[PDB]
Write a protein that binds this ligand. Sequence first.
Ligand SMILES: Nc1ncnc2c1ncn2[C@@H]1O[C@H](COP(=O)(O)OP(=O)(O)OP(=O)(O)O)[C@@H](O)[C@H]1O
Ligand SMILES: Nc1ncnc2c1ncn2[C@@H]1O[C@H](COP(=O)(O)OP(=O)(O)OP(=O)(O)O)[C@@H](O)[C@H]1O
Ligand SMILES: Nc1ncnc2c1ncn2[C@@H]1O[C@H](COP(=O)(O)OP(=O)(O)OP(=O)(O)O)[C@@H](O)[C@H]1O
Ligand SMILES: Nc1cc(C(F)(F)F)cc(C(F)(F)F)c1
Ligand SMILES: [Ca+2]
Ligand SMILES: [Mg+2]
Ligand SMILES: [Mg+2]
Ligand SMILES: [Mg+2]
Lengths: 332, 333, 332
Amino acid sequence: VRNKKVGVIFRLIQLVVLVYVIGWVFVYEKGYQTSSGLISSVSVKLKGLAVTQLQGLGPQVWDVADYVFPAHGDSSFVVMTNFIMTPQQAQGHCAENPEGGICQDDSGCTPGKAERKAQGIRTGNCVPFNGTVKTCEIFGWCPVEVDDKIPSPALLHEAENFTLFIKNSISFPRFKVNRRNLVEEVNGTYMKKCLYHKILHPLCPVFSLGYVVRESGQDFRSLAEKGGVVGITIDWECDLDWHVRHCKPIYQFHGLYGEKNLSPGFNFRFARHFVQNGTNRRHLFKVFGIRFDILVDGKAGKFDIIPTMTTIGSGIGIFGVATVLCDLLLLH
Amino acid sequence: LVRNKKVGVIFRLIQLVVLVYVIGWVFVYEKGYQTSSGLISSVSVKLKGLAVTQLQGLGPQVWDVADYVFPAHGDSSFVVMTNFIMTPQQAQGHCAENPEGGICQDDSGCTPGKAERKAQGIRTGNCVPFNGTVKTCEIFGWCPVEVDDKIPSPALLHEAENFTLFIKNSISFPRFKVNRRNLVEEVNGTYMKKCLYHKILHPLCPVFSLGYVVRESGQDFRSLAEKGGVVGITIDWECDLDWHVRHCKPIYQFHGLYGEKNLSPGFNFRFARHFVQNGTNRRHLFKVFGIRFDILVDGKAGKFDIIPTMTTIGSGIGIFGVATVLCDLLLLH
Amino acid sequence: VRNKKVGVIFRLIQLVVLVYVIGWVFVYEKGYQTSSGLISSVSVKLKGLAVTQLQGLGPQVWDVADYVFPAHGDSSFVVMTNFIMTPQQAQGHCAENPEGGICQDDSGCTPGKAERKAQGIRTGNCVPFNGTVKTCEIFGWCPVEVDDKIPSPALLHEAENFTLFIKNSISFPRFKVNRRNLVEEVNGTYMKKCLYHKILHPLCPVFSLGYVVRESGQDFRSLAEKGGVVGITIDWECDLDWHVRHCKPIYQFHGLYGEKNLSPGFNFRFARHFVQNGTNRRHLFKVFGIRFDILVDGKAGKFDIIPTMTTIGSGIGIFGVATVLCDLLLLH
Ligand SMILES: Nc1ncnc2c1ncn2[C@@H]1O[C@H](COP(=O)(O)OP(=O)(O)OP(=O)(O)O)[C@@H](O)[C@H]1O
Ligand SMILES: Nc1ncnc2c1ncn2[C@@H]1O[C@H](COP(=O)(O)OP(=O)(O)OP(=O)(O)O)[C@@H](O)[C@H]1O
Ligand SMILES: Nc1ncnc2c1ncn2[C@@H]1O[C@H](COP(=O)(O)OP(=O)(O)OP(=O)(O)O)[C@@H](O)[C@H]1O
Ligand SMILES: Nc1cc(C(F)(F)F)cc(C(F)(F)F)c1
Ligand SMILES: [Ca+2]
Ligand SMILES: [Mg+2]
Ligand SMILES: [Mg+2]
Ligand SMILES: [Mg+2]
């Protein structure tokens, strides 16, 4: 390389490369710290109550143990928003649902079980389901669940006021640091009366379900009418070089949905088996509820000698490479 | 200094090859001009089917969607009932324990307390004969102790290979703010009315046959349902957002998570349905051997961006210079 | 650059760079092995029994299907350690909990529902909860749960003898290799009588809950009194270049806890609905239990030729770069 008093033409390039190395690779990219993931655990608590007046059954009270189907508290929990109830289900021959099939004569139906959407073992006769249409007689739960009529006004429409408390405990084992979403800032008197907000209360662990649904980008009424999916993501990007107080979680609410023309909403059927008058019966509930999925992911970085030395060596190497490259480009 | 005296194309061809490699595998193949991110996915599983099991002494039992589905709400890890051992009318009262726990001919042999390993009840101290042949120790617990020695070889819920499964997978890339569902624009309502998933015939069908899934996982459905098994369905969403969003389609892959059948074969678990009958708190115990289906979704997106393109061009120029210098030094020794 | 009897000054640097390439880059970092992840499935089985004598209810036997709420078997499961029981809950008008509010006269309470911690629809009257304090009349579960007195002696304190058998089946699909925690070493007679230990029995699949809690860094009594979270991480770092017998899992126990002054432990509520004497009743249970979450992650490495050639090429390149750099640094 010719050095006939080139001047600052390459001396400035050297300084620029050095500044870039010491700023972006070392400080910006946090190259002087080792990073590790966390082990996380989420507990959910839904405080609320819903009094639903249902024709033929009277008032029904839904408490924390009622709308919460897991009833133990985990990441993927579902809060009841609407339900279709078919009680007093006993095992006996009965007329099947009109959606399964319509046979005016008993010769039309065949003894056996349907391959698609099996509702029961067909006896072989067609018993009129009502005065208009006739269905085939099958053995199974006698009161069939007719989901054709879905309640337009949400029965558990108060779910937008059911307070959701999320206790997220994370632990970095590489540095042996255990933290919880209940930061030192948050305390008892705060949790006595507080609601989470993006800017007002960014650390409140009490998330209003309505507020969460609104932040996810969905209307609470239309979603509760049929069902939906909301994902709460808890990030724990922190720097352990500072005090532990400066580490705070970040909550982000996403809405997982799709086209409302094909299978709109989230619905599932469950049963409550019991024994009444010496007979084994059950109450079938087809519930459309919102599925809240909690995903916690974070990373902690602490100062370490080996990564710092490795980054310094790589920076010196790339500085030399860039100097040689710029010299060759200037000299062509 | 590098000697340059009519070297020829010996190094020019090397430079051209390096430039092609930079503009190719580095840029086009590895998608160096696109930024990538993961998705937030949620799975909803719905089982459609019904099983009529004729049990001696209990009559016909109808297992519907709310019966074989134990979570009953829909989770990535869900178990479908395939066989069960039923013990009804369990009430709290002193009774003879299981012969597997312990055999004592005389009451002095048993000691009052609780067994340290595989505890079945608080030992009363007396040995009440479980039957005419063997004598077990009296313990205070559920009087009809469950005897799982005889597992039904013909699967009670053997019709599980025809039960349909609908999986609704909702993914969302927040970096690009794009939401997608496994129900692609191609899959329509009339299609979903009558459809079964297949590898080549129906690669986008969201309706899976449990028997077909078990066959694709690499296991026989009968032997699995007899004792239990684990099937993992992986949903991939590798897509490129540079094209139209319609071209983004999920990929379903089935795996069988099994082990040596000589030590603890299958998946079994005991659950109890409690109730009140005749003013007494009783329960029905079920030891169910079922298939555990674990739904795992993993995917990544890609969208054009300026900064990745610039840094890839920079790295390409940097390595093109280094490779040229290295080839020149190797040629000149 | 200048090459005139430079000596071994740069030859030693070249040799060191070559050793670094053929060593840490190739041997240590497994540059000749491609890596693949696994699909995992955890199955838990609890064995044990604990009779909890409760005043007014008699002996209560708790079996595997009782304290294990995820009876279907799940990685994230809760084991009942203490419970507050309120039996025979029927829907009707009753006095609310004194924690909600105290109104001496009926005019003090207002008809409707509470916004925070709703216990029931207020009827507008104040019926005395007892002889001392007076609360507002609400419609709901008549036996309101009074969780003020938490039993200091843990009812299910025998949870430290509840043997936990974990079956973790993993599969690497890229290499199509299936593995299970029941390794070839662990035989039937071994599983007949063994307890897991860090050094003594590092392969026994029977984990004692008390031992796990002790290894997590928490006392079992104080934790079971109010609840806790213990996470079991099962790693499967293996090298498929050797025989599959050498691949053994690694179990680690972490304790995910926080400040005990604000929301201590893990607690939830559930109910058992039934029909007695023609009336729909339930038994409410507020359970303080330990939450066990099983997280499984691993990596399998198999010899491949493409990563080997890539690492060889990168090593030759960085060796040439380091040679040029050291020569330029020596010649200034
Ligand atoms: N497991 C399944 N097997 C086959 N088809 C299914 C299954 N689950 C859903 N479907 C079909 O997809 C439609 C929409 O699915 P979705 O989960 O929204 O149920 P739905 O509309 O409430 O109907 P249903 O009450 O019959 O479950 C169903 O009406 C049915 O035609
Ligand atoms: N938590 C546990 N503590 C001790 N032994 C256990 C535990 N879980 C399973 N085992 C033992 O593992 C072996 C196989 O259990 P597996 O569940 O595969 O079969 P099983 O016949 O259903 O067992 P069991 O009748 O004891 O429930 C048996 O010896 C069983 O006692
Ligand atoms: N979803 C929620 N909405 C409002 N406050 C809540 C919620 N979950 C918990 N809290 C409050 O957090 C504090 C401690 O919560 P924790 O989960 O330990 O319940 P707790 O102390 O057993 O009380 P409770 O029996 O009322 O649930 C209490 O003040 C409690 O009322
Ligand atoms: N085994 C298990 C359990 C849950 C839970 F229901 F127990 F929380 C969730 C999951 C998830 F799908 F999230 F991975 C897995
Ligand atoms: Ca009952
Ligand atoms: Mg329908
Ligand atoms: Mg047994
Ligand atoms: Mg309270």
